[model samples]
Target: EEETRELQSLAAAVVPSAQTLKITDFSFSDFELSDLETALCTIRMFTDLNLVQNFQMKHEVLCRWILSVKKNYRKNVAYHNWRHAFNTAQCMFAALKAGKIQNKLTDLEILALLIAALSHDLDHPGVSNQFLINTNSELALMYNDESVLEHHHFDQCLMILNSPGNQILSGLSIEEYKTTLKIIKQAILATDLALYIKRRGEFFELIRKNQFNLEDPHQKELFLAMLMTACDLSAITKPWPIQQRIAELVATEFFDQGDRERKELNIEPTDLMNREKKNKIPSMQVGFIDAICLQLYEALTHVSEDCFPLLDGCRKNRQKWQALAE
Candidate 1:
């Protein structure tokens, strides 16, 4: 009973009116990375607005679910924490709102995408898939070395949704709920950058052959996968200062992993992960922008000119990184 009362109190505290936050105005750089609660509040506000306005989802139930979901994120990780989750979801919110994808997505797809974005990195252990596999971690065994972190994240999301007091999707019919869960699974797994790297050729082939179609389910799934990839790397598409800070946070996390690999596993860390090679980050960012991010936003813009701002931001940040590399 006490647990239920506490959850109800948290739900009440996260009401939309309690926070004046607007998703459009929320900036990762503006919020101190230390202010995690504000980040959670921002996510709750954006999600509440989107779900209530579009799907007519019950606010009380949704808020309770959102709070519960936020609580699932661990706070100690340097990156891939609640702040990163909020940032990813914020980018998705921005893309749907500013990139004009709303008319294209059904209400169900939008909800699934938002949920996937929010839950993509839940309970991350601040280590890479390689780190887990090399250490012979249980997650590696559980997933059988195939997109280990992504699979765990999807499972954690389902676990939360299945738990009592967190059935935010109960309002939907059984068929609708099942379909939404399927879409959410695909979207979350698509966040695996390793998988994305392998599929980039197919994505480009779809574009080159002029075969992209949103109405077709397979084509739509591919597009949604690409969209999730973009959102996952959305840090590189932000303004330069934000990009710099995000890069530093990511590098810190990478170096932390490197430290662990060296001491715990007695293995030499990769160039990007090694703190001894910290000076290489600027140059690495340049390559990452030119190779990965540039190609991504370019493809996205090809689908809709509404995404030009993302491309523009990527270009500007790339230039900043290039200057630093010099």
Candidate 2:
């Protein structure tokens, strides 16, 4: 949990410094397109031949994909960007590497993570859970209160998955395709904050009770499911500077949502745009960040040692945010 908070803080702090976009920002220069193509080609090579030469390419593709989607927006914002996707990929990759999951993570699994990350927040409307709930938007109608934002994320991913020339996993057999589909669904759906806390708590209990029987393939899959969830929530464990940036982006997201609520719903603007508001208080967000981090951090303690640095980073970032609030 400390790790999650720390990473959130790092994310928040870096958001202001991240690049913003105009229409021109999406204009892929020859060099940029070439760079992206080279990266994708490397991804092709890795998947086709299982080479280590392009692990970085996975990162590039997902990051670029996120960027490409957000470019449709008339104005750029921090909450949903290639950077957030990139950050999530970095965190997920770190978790994978730390857990020694390379052997367990087949090329398909790796590819699934990349694709899921890119599509997770595709076509985001720069809003948050509370806004959708309050405004009774169509997204709210589709998913009910079950997982407002998360449902949209899943739909967005599938929409792209169905697009022509974007069926990245078209070659797989039904079973293999199912494996990819399952992992991708699990990863994206895990982002639902309402479901997140309860499921993460279940994982903690599983490890605490020694219920993780790794010899069973089903149990192993369950464990991996928890790990993926942890990765999604691992912002709490990231380094302080990085976590600050994450937190800032989250706050900005809330602000953007508040703005939408103001204009579209004819509601008075909430304090989302006001840095001095109670909800925007550094102490408040830091507390929020830490609470979630600590919960997941406790689970990671029992399940694996990889979360230690992330937890430490979260602690440091929490202190920094606390000070900033003062």
Candidate 3:
């Protein structure tokens, strides 16, 4: 317990910028680990395998990465316009739980998945992929017009790995860390919408072929990688409370993008009220949840036993929207 506390202290010192919702301030004794947060904190805690071995230099690189993510915030959007670091963490946990019970993902693979998810959107700019590409921003330049947002995210993760403050993971014999870093980068980068549909198809095909091999290292990596990505996009499969939170966030993101588009193109902005006024985002929460759930339900049907409950939740959320819209 003392060791855990010390580790948390080190982690907090290195990555100090987590969103402090009213809920996070409760005493440790009062803390309840949501399934998602538990998965996230587990990964954060276990990554210490690198630290305990005295990889101080590599540890500093990890610290810088955590710091970079901690400092990223989008102030313009209201409720949902925040950096999704915690959400990303939660998603990792969800994916891990699903994978462990259904797909039988190993411990190391789960660790990779957790790190990938935590750093997936480490420093999001609160803007959409289209906005970055359309604007031809610096990030676009760095990514050479390919998966610009994803490239930026991967760069942020890598920058932290290369940064001087926390290089703890760097000391692993190059071969050892190479695959780990690759998996991390690939999982983080796969969150790109540009690749989302394509990857979804790929995962479905794997499911169809029964090509999944939990025993094969490569297959295991690919399986969990896709699982994390799936959960990252699983806002629609959750219960109403979770669904509403996701809706609030999506609305926030839309407003922010709307403002950017209005400024750059001189068009009317897409505010929540205005979007609602036009029925632009009507039943958006329910509709979105149902849409993604159908996809996930189809793709992972054979792989996950718990998916039916999630799919049912999506259906319920959509029905609630239908009633509300009436």
Candidate 4:
């Protein structure tokens, strides 16, 4: 234990600036990424969750860590960049703050949720795992094709957090550090659609059996895992315009991958990824909603009636997509 003692005690620093006006501003503008709205919304989440006060985290260290996280994300990606991460985190925060989900989660879990959400797609290179696997990318080889991007995301998140002056977790006790990291890693990996399909079965079964107890450790982990997917795909739950915009963003990224597949691999890309099927976009949206979003939002409301708004929004958007398809 003595060997693990802090070599550089960050707690010794009494305080930095009280307000964060110029705090997170270091990463502001000059880049194509988010300028100010994302940072302020993050601070609002921290305050709403009371994370800083509960965890004894220094403002300066936390803000520094946040800036580093933002900077690490690739700016060129259409989706799965820092902006996606921020939106995912915001969705999680909304679920907690507005949907009464916070009542079931521990403060530690809340902290981990935000951290994992914000870092879920860190360094994402605007491509899917299938793209990486087919291309024989280094990350694919490293992870052996099992959730390649998710593994990289968590590892890269760790690197940024552990690097100098970005030790936001340094203030945490050893137990807290281990527990939070464990949750963060699992939460990040659970964003995989494949994992969601498997885990959502268990989740729905638990809900159906009326045995979905948050007090139970196993089911609680399932709850957290499902929440990550719900928030990750929360775009489908937004209004028509917002949902339409994100759909196009995902389509553009998918089409970019398809374009590469044709030139690089000389294989036929899937219909969803193919740019030639662009006119089928509305039908694609309908199928996507039918296949994923509809069931997810419906099940979420089964867990908590506060989540009915998400279901309602998703349903309304699904109808619009269906209408357009016809």
lDDT of each residue in 1-326, candidate 2, tens digit only: 65345333332332211122111111111123332332343233233324233333333333333334434332476666554554455455545455445555667667676566545665567777777777788888888866776677777777666554345455567787788888887767766666666666656677778886566765555555565555565555555555666667777777666666667887766565544474455777577667676666556655566556655656666787788887
- The local distance difference test score of each candidate is 0.80, 0.56, 0.56, 0.80
Q: Regarding TM-score, does 1 or 3 come out ahead?
A: 1
lDDT of 3: 0.56
Q: Which residue pairs show collisions in model 4? A: none
What is the clash count for each candidate, in the order shown? 0, 37, 15, 0
Candidate 1, residues 96-196: lDDT per residue as tens digits? Answer: 77677767888889889988998999899999998899899999999999999999999999998888766878878899999999999999999998878
Q: Candidate 3 on 94-198: residue-level lDDT in tens? A: 433432342375444555565666567755677766667778778877787787767777777777666665464655667657877777777877677556566
Best TM-score among the predictions, by candidate number: 1
In model 4, which runs have C-alpha deviations exceeding 4 angstroms?
1-34
Those runs of model 3 whose alpha carbons end farther than 4 Å from true positions after fitting are: 1-68, 73-83, 98-103, 106-108, 209-211, 214-222, 268-278, 307-309
Root-mean-square deviation of each candidate, in angstroms?
2.8, 10.3, 6.6, 6.7
Cα error, candidate 1, residue 188 (Å):
0.6
TM-score of candidate 1 against the unseen true structure: 0.90
lDDT of 4 by residue, 1-326 (tens): 43123212322322323143222221122124243446655666776688888887776666667777887888777777777788788778778866788998999899999999999998998888989998999999999999999999999999987898778778689999999999999999999899988778888888888888888998888889899998888878877777788888899889988988999999999998899999889888888888888888788889888878778888888899888888
